[PDB]
Design a protein around this nucleic acid. Structure first.
Ligand SMILES: Nc1ccn([C@H]2CC[C@@H](COP(=O)(O)OP(=O)(O)OP(=O)(O)O)O2)c(=O)n1
Ligand SMILES: Nc1ccn([C@H]2CC[C@@H](COP(=O)(O)OP(=O)(O)OP(=O)(O)O)O2)c(=O)n1
Ligand SMILES: [Mn+2]
Length: 579
DNA sequence: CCTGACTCC
DNA sequence: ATAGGAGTCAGG
């Protein structure tokens, strides 16, 4: 039902100046993964190529790297990175159907061509899972079946490009795609392929010592409990705490007794076993995830880890980071923070440079809500996190520890994003009336924010979606539900998404501007990581002075708001030291 | 495969 | 019922 050539060699007609291109990588983690097949669809016909054929043909390789030869793809970053691992540069990607579908509606969870195609009632392609199978049954099918699938995917991209661009234009999102997300994709591809170097000697020594410490805490816990049990089974743990030791039950979940850190912290006055358990579970997570799990994904020959930044996943426009997640490396406790000493520059005499947007979503909220007082606070370069700390812990500015500020930061974001009096009371261990009064006072200090939150909820109910500064969208079809719980959750999404998503838009634009300023000054400095509102680079030590000016300035100027943007920055020999 | 832990923004 | 957005882990 669809004609195509199963080609034995590369012909000139396959190398047109516009094409849909499929470079198929079936492994979920595309780093150093097999390319199983190629398809090309263009004005001259539909072609399947074996990867041995195409990728060793010098003309096809040249065409791939020719920016003036334009390609329409789905998940071009997967292709771009897989090719880099095969020693080949991919340029000229002018349309990415994955990113287009993502901007139109992030809730569709589009993660294959078929699922994008569904959005325009296009049915002439199968889901990837139907062709490859799942789990231990997953396999590349016979060549004629594989070839048809890949050609059908390229034909779908070829046919769907205009319908998608048209819809993006109608939503005023086409610039978001072509000027922001697509260029960002190429930058993320570079960062992923570069990787981050790990000091495995230091990481292994930390793990050996951690295992000893864990053994000691484990035995103390068994002593306090009067018996051995699996501390990592909330179930067995629940029996020890709430049945054997008869501690109060402060919370249940659908499977039994809660032992969350929130709960255990509240039980600390009753038995010393609870603080030990909290510490054990922290140390246990460092072991399982940031030592052992990390070492499992280190590429042994180069000592590098290569994350994947998922650019079409979150509902607000943030990125996420997988295998490993390098956006949740410990920082808040010194014990955990030492893991960062194992993240080092990739060359001798280079350093790590880290830059973080100050009070980012508060600044964004001040702009969007046009709250006079909040705007005024940022024009005076106040620190709203430190101020809230002073207020809660009734201490002076000088007496506010970095830890009280972290706690106050949670209070600030919690309040603006709809925390209840119950929730704040449980967090601060104050009565509910006092919590309610604290929130009352807070919105009296920031009345524009209060009005803005009331109004964005109403707007969402009327339109069925909310939007960000650069026209990102999130639909909220639950926002008129008769069910209180369902409706309330959607209401809080309406409060949060525009602010978090607008901050995501800002850092994304900052990465594009920054990458261009680095390349034009021919600096060796390059991006390693994005951590939501932070950028991490490495550079020769001689470039530090330049970066100290360039990076904060580019980040601060990415967008112009009604309040200043401000960036904190540091550098050092390891990620730990870049503080 | 899901739940509930710990980790971050 | 009770700020929002994420990923990985061991045990269920
Ligand atoms: N065709 C368009 C138009 C806009 N945008 C995004 C990127 C910029 C942002 C703001 O667009 P503006 O050109 O500034 O439009 P405005 O009317 O000046 O601002 P707005 O429409 O958001 O009030 O929206 C887009 O992606 N595609
Ligand atoms: N508990 C938290 C922490 C963070 N965030 C969101 C809002 C801010 C954004 C970036 O996180 P941080 O850098 O920790 O917050 P910040 O306000 O930029 O604080 P800082 O001035 O320390 O950079 O993530 C959140 O919703 N809830
Ligand atoms: Mn910040």
């Amino acid at each position: 039902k669809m004609a195509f050539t199963l080609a034995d060699r590369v012909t000139e007609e396959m190398l047109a100046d516009k094409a849909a291109l499929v470079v198929e990588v079936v492994e979920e983690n595309y780093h150093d993964a097999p390319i199983v097949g190629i398809a090309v669809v263009n004005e001259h016909g539909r072609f399947f190529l074996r990867p041995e054929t195409a990728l060793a043909d010098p003309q096809f390789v040249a065409w791939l790297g020719d920016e003036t030869k334009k390609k329409s793809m789905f998940d071009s970053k997967r292709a771009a990175v897989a090719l880099k691992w095969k020693g080949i540069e991919l340029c000229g990607v002018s349309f990415d159907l994955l990113l287009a579908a993502y901007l139109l509606d992030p809730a569709q969870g589009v993660d294959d061509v078929a699922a994008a195609a569904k959005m325009k009632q296009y049915e002439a392609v199968r889901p990837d899972e139907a062709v490859y199978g799942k789990g231990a049954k997953r396999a590349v099918p016979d060549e004629p079946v594989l070839a048809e699938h890949l050609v059908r995917k390229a034909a779908a991209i070829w046919e769907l490009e205009r319908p998608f661009l048209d819809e993006l234009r109608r939503n005023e999102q086409d610039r978001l795609l072509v000027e922001l997300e697509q260029p960002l994709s190429s930058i993320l591809a570079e960062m992923e392929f570069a990787g981050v170097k790990v000091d495995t000697k230091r990481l292994e020594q930390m793990g050996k010592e951690l295992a000893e410490q864990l053994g000691t805490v484990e035995q103390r816990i068994y002593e306090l409990a009067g018996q051995e049990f699996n501390i990592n089974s909330p179930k067995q743990l629940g029996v020890i705490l709430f049945e054997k030791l008869q501690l109060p039950v402060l919370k249940k979940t659908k499977t039994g007794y809660s032992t969350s850190a929130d709960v255990l912290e509240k039980l600390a006055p009753y038995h010393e076993i609870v603080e030990n358990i909290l510490h054990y579970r922290q140390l246990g997570k460092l072991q399982s995830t940031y030592i052992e799990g990390l070492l499992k994904v280190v590429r042994p020959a180069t000592k590098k880890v290569h994350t994947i930044f998922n650019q079409a996943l979150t509902q607000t426009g943030r990125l996420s980071s997988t295998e490993p997640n390098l956006q949740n490396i410990p920082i808040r406790l010194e014990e955990g923070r030492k893991i960062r000493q194992a993240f080092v520059p990739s060359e001798s005499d280079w350093l790590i440079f880290a830059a973080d947007y100050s009070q980012i979503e508060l600044r964004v909220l001040a702009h969007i809500a046009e709250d006079d007082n909040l705007m005024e606070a940022f024009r005076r370069d106040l620190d709203i996190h430190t101020k809230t700390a002073m207020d809660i812990f009734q201490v002076s500015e000088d007496e506010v520890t970095p830890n009280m500020r972290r706690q106050a930061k949670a209070v600030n974001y919690g309040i603006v994003y709809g925390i209840s009096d119950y929730g704040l009371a449980q967090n601060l261990n104050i009565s509910r009336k006092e919590a309610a009064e604290f929130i009352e006072r807070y919105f009296e200090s920031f009345p524009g924010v209060k009005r803005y939150m009331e109004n964005i909820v109403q707007e969402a109910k009327q339109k069925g979606y909310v939007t960000t500064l650069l026209h990102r969208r999130r639909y909220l079809p639950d926002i008129t539900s008769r069910n209180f719980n369902v409706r309330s959750f959607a209401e809080r999404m309406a409060m949060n998404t525009p602010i978090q998503g607008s901050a995501a838009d800002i850092i994304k634009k900052a990465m594009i501007d920054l990458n261009a300023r680095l390349k034009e000054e021919r600096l060796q400095a390059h991006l390693l990581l994005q951590v939501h509102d932070e950028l991490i680079l490495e550079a020769p030590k001689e470039e530090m002075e330049r970066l100290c000016r360039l990076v904060p300035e580019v980040m601060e100027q990415a967008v112009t708001l009604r309040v200043p943007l401000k960036v904190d920055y540091h550098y050092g020999s390891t990620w730990y030291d870049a503080k």
